[model samples]
Target: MIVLENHTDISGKTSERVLHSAWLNSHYQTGLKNLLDTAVLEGTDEESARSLASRWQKIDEIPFDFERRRMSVVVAENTEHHQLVCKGALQEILNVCSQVRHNGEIVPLDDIMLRKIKRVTDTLNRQGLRVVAVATKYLPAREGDYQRADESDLILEGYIAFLD
Candidate 1:
């Protein structure tokens, strides 16, 4: 839930646009927007989404594509650090993650943790939920352009499952 709340792109003006957009074209984003509004922000207004989004300053975006199967956003959490927050297909997201957040601590993504993750995701899939995974990596505050290569060695935040 924390992953969906902080890492998702459907917030602020994006929230308003997605919520009111043509459902057929933007249903997935729209669904995520609504979920964030009701489940995480606990409010039904764009202001709530804005308030949540206001916590970080967005710096850049790596758009999603059919080939990449993932998208990422670069946000400045503070003066000293920038974070790359990413979300996408569970397999793609897991590929770039070197660490996993478990029981509130960050730990190495080992075989055991991978098995557990697979188990949970498999259960959700069996129940017919579409699962999306989220991850983040910290980068030093610097002056330069970022790219897809910056996505590696991320810390897996967790997953979000949606019912179709």
Candidate 2:
């Protein structure tokens, strides 16, 4: 089976207009564009990846105590195609935070991997509940090796107030 994944700017369509620095908010309503494929490694299952691609939508189930004032979260990955044995979980977390909160964290210049995973989580610990995060595998079948044919065989779980 083949899958296509994508992202479009949530900002509504507004034609690009040249503006001077004096018009600070002129670029506020930029148009959405279909972003190209980015990779997800850890914390990213096939289902979740599809959400980013526009084929499906990732849902955020409001927790039982949501009315008591809780932050809702939509988990996602920061980059496309993380390498094996990597720490992509935090990248997913950052993707959620940055897009949802507009909290403005600096995305890393490098690809997501285990080493960055360690550092990202460590930084999150230091940040004390913002700015960062603390941070799946599989195969197919052969006659002797039985595996589920489910395209999305892995799941990434997270909580909104889990950090709190």
Candidate 3:
């Protein structure tokens, strides 16, 4: 949330343009850009990321009372090559039983072995893996100043519509 004070111009006319905190606004907008980039990498357009991303919130049957985010993986042209190469490479790595010396005794590296399994599973599931998020309050923006402003009127409270 943020707020801008009303400043009278030299001519005594109030300027419609508010004094935006460059530092805060720039960071806020940059955050949105990052989200947009993630959506694109996950095979989504900016518009879909900003709107209707939570459409499936009630679809899984358990129905979330709050908003939900989603992500998906798309089979790009490189999917086949990636699948084959990654499978072969990881398969070879998994074929070996990693070992370690614990307390000067030979022992199987459980952590390494488990991690390898997880890695293989994650890689194989890359075709369907996705990322998503949604605003807890998915609604339109308010008018005028923020709903809550600090004594300096510099703090503005409002919803981030771009994520809804």
Candidate 4:
């Protein structure tokens, strides 16, 4: 559920192929790499993350914009299927999700669960933690092009709260 690079340089060079951990280490000033390193059970490192990224081929990206408040990466898995991974402000992320992961099961995101999620996030906010929600949706492998409109019916993976 890590955020990967989705931008291109003036000369058209892109960092889309960069491993998630390496991208964070090189582009961000935050402690996200350290956080993932300590939090992920498998222990995130440049090599480990690179190994995982190797399995997926970057296909396209919907860059983050202020108005959208989110970004997504379309990637092909083992050259078999495509999926979009996204993360952003909780509310914005929730807006595009139709289902959520609950206790190891995927379930419809009903009103009750939505309220409960908001309540939990509110409590965390009160404690001065910043929360970001993660979500994903599988796409048709034959459909290489994607747009913001495609960022729908995602499965919310949950939230990550940061002290900063």
Candidate 5:
């Protein structure tokens, strides 16, 4: 049972309302801890907890780390020529990978979990794309729901000039 103080802001309104927020208190050192707990409740133990490996496939083992703080994306403004250009841009971004300098040089970019990832602007540009704006935004928490399994994610949107 939860209780809210009866109060209202200026402009003559009831000072009481229930707010459903997905942001949880920082009880755990990391935000993904809660997500893992939720997953465990769903039968994904440490050895079995993993996200979808692909669109339709999930890894049989647990993730070495949690999802990063920022969700990275490479995008271009929607245009009549977007279909072809976007396809090439996505391919370039997907091809972005690097090998480690040690351990038989086996570690690749895909094998590491990161707190922040970069947009493929260079690749997009190489594929004849451009960027016009950059901004950051957090997805709003779902209303009337405290536990948003999908939080701690950020996004970047790109825009392109319409050259005629």
Candidate 6:
């Protein structure tokens, strides 16, 4: 739920998509909990929370050291170029997929789950995608985002906006 501001110039965009293959364990869950900041609820309705939680149902069954890699993408404000940017990302992910599935003892991604993630990335690549599509309408908006589920040396950005 990020809203675009006047201007936010980042240092750079992602040249190559990378997957941080994590082992499913208390450490992973703790990292997830730390990232989500459960102290504050994000959704407005009960159903949305339930829906998102349902998508996370597999969290408990993961083996103590099971693999759990998250798709991480860092993008830019040039929404017009998103298709090109993500096409390369797609290739990177596909290559990773082959390795995770066929090269060793790793389990393959379930078709349904893979489809769900692909659906998200493909949809976000369209030009002029707006943050308002997911954020509160009253706030000003931005053209793009650059968040990876797992970012190191990241800083918290806080703002206060009032209607007065």
Compared with the true structure, the alpha-carbon lDDT of candidate 4 equals: 0.59
Tens-digit per-residue lDDT, 1-164, candidate 4: 43321222111233232224223222222212244323332324567566656766677776667787777777665566776777667789888999876655778989887887777777767877655566777766765467889889988766544543
**lDDT (CA) for every model shown?**
0.59, 0.22, 0.23, 0.59, 0.21, 0.24
lDDT of 1 by residue, 40-137 (tens): 33322466445536656666766666777777777764878987777777899888989987665788999998888788778767877666676777
Q: What C-alpha RMSD separates each model from the true structure?
A: 8.7, 17.4, 24.7, 10.4, 21.9, 18.7
Error of 6 at 90 (Å): 1.9
- Which residue pairs does candidate 2 place in steric collision? 5-53, 6-52, 6-53, 38-80, 39-80, 39-81, 76-92
lDDT by residue (tens digit), candidate 5, 1-164: 11121111111122111000010111112323433223213322222222211111211111113232311211112221110011012223233223211222233334331111233334334554332211112232222322222221221122221111
What is the clash count for each candidate, in the order shown? 0, 7, 5, 0, 2, 2
Worst 10 residues of 6 by lDDT: 131-140
Q: How many backbone clashes does candidate 5 have?
A: 2
How does each model score on TM-score?
A: 0.71, 0.19, 0.17, 0.69, 0.16, 0.21
| Superposed model 5: Cα runs more than 4 Å off | 1-119, 138-155, 158-164
Task: Please report, as a residue range, the 10-residue window in candidate 5 with the lowest summed lDDT.
Answer: 17-26
Candidate 2, residues 66-152, lDDT tens digits: the string is 122211212223322221110112444333232110112223323343344346345444645332121111122122321222212
**lDDT tens string, model 3, 1-164?**
12221221111223221111111222222213344333223433345434333321211111111122111111112212210000012222233224322233444647663464455345434634321211011122222232111111111111111121
lDDT, candidate 2, equals 0.22
lDDT digits (tens) for residues 42-63 of candidate 6: 2123564444334322221111
Model 4 RMSD in angstroms: 10.4
Tell me which residue pairs clash in candidate 5. 7-15, 8-15
